[PDB]
Amino acid sequence: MKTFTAKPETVKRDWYVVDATGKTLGRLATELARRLRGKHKAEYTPHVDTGDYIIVLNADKVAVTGNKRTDKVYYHHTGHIGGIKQATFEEMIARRPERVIEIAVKGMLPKGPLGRAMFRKLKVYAGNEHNHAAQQPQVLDI
Amino acid sequence: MYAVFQSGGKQHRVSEGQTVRLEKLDIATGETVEFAEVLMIANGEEVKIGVPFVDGGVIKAEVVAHGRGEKVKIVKFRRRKHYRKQQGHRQWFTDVKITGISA
Amino acid sequence: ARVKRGVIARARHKKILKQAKGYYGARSRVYRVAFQAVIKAGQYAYRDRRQRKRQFRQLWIARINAAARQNGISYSKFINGLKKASVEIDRKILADIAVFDKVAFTALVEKAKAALA
Amino acid sequence: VTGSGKKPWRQKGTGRARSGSIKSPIWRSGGVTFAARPQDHSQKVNKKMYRGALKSILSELVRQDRLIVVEKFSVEAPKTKLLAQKLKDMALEDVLIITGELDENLFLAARNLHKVDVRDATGIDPVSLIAFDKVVMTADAVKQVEEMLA
Amino acid sequence: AVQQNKPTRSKRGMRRSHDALTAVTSLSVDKTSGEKHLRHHITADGYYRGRKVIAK
Amino acid sequence: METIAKHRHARSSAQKVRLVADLIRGKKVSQALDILTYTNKKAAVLVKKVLESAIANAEHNDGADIDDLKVTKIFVDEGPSMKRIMPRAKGRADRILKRTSHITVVVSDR
Amino acid sequence: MRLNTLSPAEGSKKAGKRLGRGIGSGLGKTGGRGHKGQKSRSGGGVRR
RNA sequence: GUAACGGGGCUAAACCAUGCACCGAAGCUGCGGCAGCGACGCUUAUGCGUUGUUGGGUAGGGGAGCGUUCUGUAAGCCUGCGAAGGUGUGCUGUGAGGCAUGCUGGAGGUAUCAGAAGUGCGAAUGCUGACAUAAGUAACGAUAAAGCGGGUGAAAAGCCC
RNA sequence: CCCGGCGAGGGGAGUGAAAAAGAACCUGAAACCGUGUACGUACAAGCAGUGGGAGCACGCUUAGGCGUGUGACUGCGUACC
């Protein structure tokens, strides 16, 4: 005999709305990454990205907890001028508020290509203004 | 409906109507394969058993071919050492078709 | 007795370029790179003869995990409850019922959590 | 190879071959490294081992019923046509004839016969003697071969 | 400079892919003759918008 | 019904004929022949003689009609190449290889 | 005819190594002469 | 350029005191196949039945078999009633290899077993051929340049007038 | 007989057992470049392989989950002498 394994047509997903107003960055983020892989689910497969279809409801107000924030400064060096270059903790929630969650679940996903297919299943939008009214999201408290 | 039984030192999941292949039997085509070493049947519903080789159960089958397979090759190699080796083995089998497994 | 040299090798050559059917570029049209590819191919295959079973085993365990946790027990606590519970060999490869027909699997799990000590 | 001791050379260490001599076996064509010499593959041959290997093949020729022993086999004249009309009459084809006496009339026969062949008992040939359908013999050959095999 | 290894034959057709000859988007005939034309230049018999020019 | 014209030992590098053939590939015979008349370039007259010979034996002989004639294949292959010594800096005598092409036109009504 | 049915006594025909044949063979390169030194090379140097 | 947990993430998901669980290798084990050989039985020139530790492996040693080039049975026997060689595929063996066959091919071929060897290339910054490759990259030979009209010619910016 | 300089080269038609013997004529690999077709390549990534695999073309698969070739995609993963 041989084992059953997943196929791209069989994947269910379903739609989830994640309240983020009671929450903190990582306890949403590692639970969300887990669901977002299909590791919340029975995958039974090494190569099909299953996951949930995830609406994050807000995350515009997500605290990091404790003093690690003011040295979490989202480091990059695009190609110019001596120094490391930086971006505040304060921008990433105050402006484009999705990004704080996006690059929190990102490093929890495998290599290049399959993590790019895992990643593109999350949306956060601006906050308390989500557009997935018509799918009927199932509320989740974490 | 699905069930699990032991062919020998390997254990096999199988369903009703399934033709499956397993490690070699003595038994020929024109004779009956039957398993009382069915460990549970996963039936229509959740099964509650402790003690296996379930006495109110059978998986009834028949032989449909006894043969030997394709020739596989096994390659052993490690570089810079002038170590290269090859072996073959073919392995015997039996095909069974399952009629049993009650509802 | 002048021997020609190579009327044996024409048959080793074409077996190799046939085994090298489906490969990119020189591995399929140039004998030197065909020979290289056959050796690495069969080494990879041979690590993955064993490696396939370990990889899948990760998946056998994680599908049983989602099932069990929907049934409010953690996987290791369920397996130790079933171990403590009387006989049954069970298997990690067992639950076809985790992804489809999911009505079932609860009775074993429910037994194991209770028997736990 | 003659006509040159030249080194093609122009040093070693210059993006190329060691380029030693113009007469080297690897030099395309004109001579290869192990090409053939004159052969003589014959040995002593041990005389007590040889004669008893002919006692072996001679015993088998009576045990296998290939030894007919026609009494004083001969033709009148050194003509193929007499010997060929005799063999058909005796109901024999492709047989090894042993002359005991090198009489010319049997010794100049059989040339026209496609698979029939004539040898002398003197130092009887062991490669021939295990072949052929029958050994025809004369009683005169059985004597003179036996005195050679002692 | 030089190169590391021998390049692929798919590379030679890719490097040539933009340098190739491009379509003419069909043709012209005269308003005034059964002679065929060359788009927006003049034939030897002057036919473009009739008349006559250039009788060489 | 099909006719081959080939022109073997033709005076071209083959990339340069393939440049011209690939423009006129699949066009149907009469338009490919106009597009070919009014490109002045030397590679294009060389190919015309074989495009024209192909269509022309379809207008005669074994053919019938040319209104439904279309250029079923158009392609160019490496003909037998000649090696010549190129004169060059510091008395360098490297090889230049003088290419020809064997150019194939096939027309059919198919 | 009976010629061409003889054979040697058991193990009398030893056959012997050829050396320098195949790369999957175990024997090939160095020859059964090991890595480097005077005896891995062709026959030279030291006298009898 | 985070880059002194491998990383995400963690102010408890940490760390310390005690402990239990699980997962986790070709280990440990059973299945199916198989190598050699120890032990006992039949009972041998050859073997076969039960059982058993064993079997990662180079240098290197040793045993055994294969095709290629040629002899010998082969002066036979098969052959345009379709031979070698080329090639795609199936079958088959422990591997080398063996066999069957469509397509090609228009004359050669063949065991068992013994014997001889110029006996299997992919490398020697090895020799030759066909021909690739960076490439349609670079090259337009003292700019003793050229203009435009007619012409030979199938065709002219380089010829001729 | 067709295209063409009167050229070069091929084709048709005809010849022969055979031109899938066409003149460089024996049968004919493999590099080599190009055609024809199928399937594929624009959430797209490294020895290009291995392990898992949607799909589609073709094969009446007695349709009995197959054969044939390719394969989106992706777990895993460093050539040979």
Curated annotation (Swiss-Prot), chain A:
Pfam families associated with the record: Ribosomal_L13
Q: Which SUPFAM superfamilies does the protein's record reference?
A: Ribosomal protein L13
Tell me the PROSITE patterns matching this sequence: RIBOSOMAL_L13
Keyword annotations:
Ribonucleoprotein, Ribosomal protein
> Know the name of this protein?
Large ribosomal subunit protein uL13
Q: What is the lineage of its organism?
A: Bacteria, Pseudomonadati, Pseudomonadota, Gammaproteobacteria, Enterobacterales
Q: Give GO BP annotations, semicolon-separated.
A: cytoplasmic translation; negative regulation of translation
Q: Does the keyword Ribonucleoprotein apply?
A: yes
Role summary: This protein is one of the early assembly proteins of the 50S ribosomal subunit, although it is not seen to bind rRNA by itself. It is important during the early stages of 50S assembly.
Q: Gene3D superfamilies, alphabetically?
A: Ribosomal protein L13
One of the entry's Gene Ontology molecular-function terms is:
structural constituent of ribosome
Q: Which family does it belong to?
A: Belongs to the universal ribosomal protein uL13 family.
Organism, scientific name: Escherichia coli (strain K12)
Encoded by which gene? Answer: rplM
Curated annotation (Swiss-Prot), chain C:
Quote the SUPFAM superfamilies the UniProt record gives.
Answer: Ribosomal protein L20 (SSF74731)
In terms of InterPro entries, this protein maps to:
Ribosomal_bL20 (IPR005813), RIBOSOMAL_L20_CS (IPR049946), Ribosomal_protein_bL20_C (IPR035566)
Which Pfam families would you find in this protein's record?
Ribosomal_L20 (PF00453)
PROSITE patterns membership: RIBOSOMAL_L20
An annotated GO BP: ribosomal large subunit assembly
Which GO terms of the cellular component aspect does the record hold? cytoplasm; cytosol; cytosolic large ribosomal subunit
Query: Is Nuclease one of the keywords UniProt gives this record?
Result: no
Q: Which UniProt keywords apply?
A: Ribonucleoprotein, Ribosomal protein, RNA-binding, rRNA-binding
Record's function text: One of the primary rRNA binding proteins, it binds close to the 5'-end of the 23S rRNA. It is important during the early stages of 50S assembly.
Similarity field: Belongs to the bacterial ribosomal protein bL20 family.
Under the subunit heading, UniProt states: Part of the 50S ribosomal subunit. Contacts L21.
Tell me what this protein is called.
Answer: Large ribosomal subunit protein bL20
The species is: Escherichia coli (strain K12)
Gene that produces this protein: rplT
Swiss-Prot record, chain E:
A GO cellular-component term linked to this record = cytosolic large ribosomal subunit
Query: Electron transport: is it a keyword of this entry?
Result: no
Sequence segments annotated as region (Disordered): 1-37
Which InterPro entries does the entry link to? Ribosomal_bL32, Ribosomal_bL32_bact, Ribosomal_zn-bd
- Any coiled-coil regions, as ranges: none
Q: Which UniProt keywords apply?
A: Ribonucleoprotein, Ribosomal protein
Q: Cite the Pfam families for this sequence.
A: Ribosomal_L32p
TM helices/strands, residue ranges: none
What HAMAP family does the record tag this protein with? Ribosomal_bL32 (MF_00340)
Q: How does it assemble?
A: Part of the 50S ribosomal subunit. Contacts L17.
Homology family: Belongs to the bacterial ribosomal protein bL32 family.
Identification of the protein by name:
Large ribosomal subunit protein bL32
What is the species listed in this Swiss-Prot or TrEMBL entry? Escherichia coli (strain K12)
Query: What does the record give as the organism's lineage?
Result: Bacteria, Pseudomonadati, Pseudomonadota, Gammaproteobacteria, Enterobacterales
Its gene is rpmF
From Swiss-Prot, chain F:
Keywords, in A-Z order: Antibiotic resistance, Ribonucleoprotein, Ribosomal protein, RNA-binding, rRNA-binding
Question: Per the UniProt entry, what are the Gene Ontology biological process annotations, in alphabetical order?
Answer: assembly of large subunit precursor of preribosome; cytoplasmic translation; cytosolic ribosome assembly; response to antibiotic; ribosome assembly; translation
Top-level division of the source organism's lineage: Bacteria
Q: One Gene Ontology cellular component annotation?
A: cytoplasm
* InterPro entries from the UniProt entry: Ribosomal_uL22, Ribosomal_uL22_bac/chlpt-type, Ribosomal_uL22_bac/org-type, Ribosomal_uL22_CS, Ribosomal_uL22_sf
A Gene Ontology molecular function term of the record:
large ribosomal subunit rRNA binding
> Which Pfam families does the entry link to?
Ribosomal_L22 (PF00237)
Keyword check for Cell wall biogenesis/degradation: no
Binding of L-tryptophan occurs at: K90
Show the SUPFAM superfamilies listed in the entry.
Ribosomal protein L22
Impact after mutating R8C: In strain: SK1048; decreases translational rate, tRNA binding and subunit association at 44 degrees Celsius; does not alter 23S rRNA or uL4 interactions; not erythromycin resistant
> Has the keyword rRNA-binding been applied to this entry?
yes
| Record family assignment | Belongs to the universal ribosomal protein uL22 family.
HAMAP family per the UniProt record, alphabetical: Ribosomal_uL22_B
Q: Which additional comment does the entry carry?
A: The wild-type allele (erythromycin sensitive) is dominant over the resistant allele, and is also dominant over the temperature-sensitive allele at both low and high temperatures.
Subunit structure of this chain's protein:
Part of the 50S ribosomal subunit. In TnaC-stalled ribosomes forms part of the binding pocket for L-Trp with the leader peptide and uL4.
Q: What is this protein called?
A: Large ribosomal subunit protein uL22
Annotated source species: Escherichia coli (strain K12)
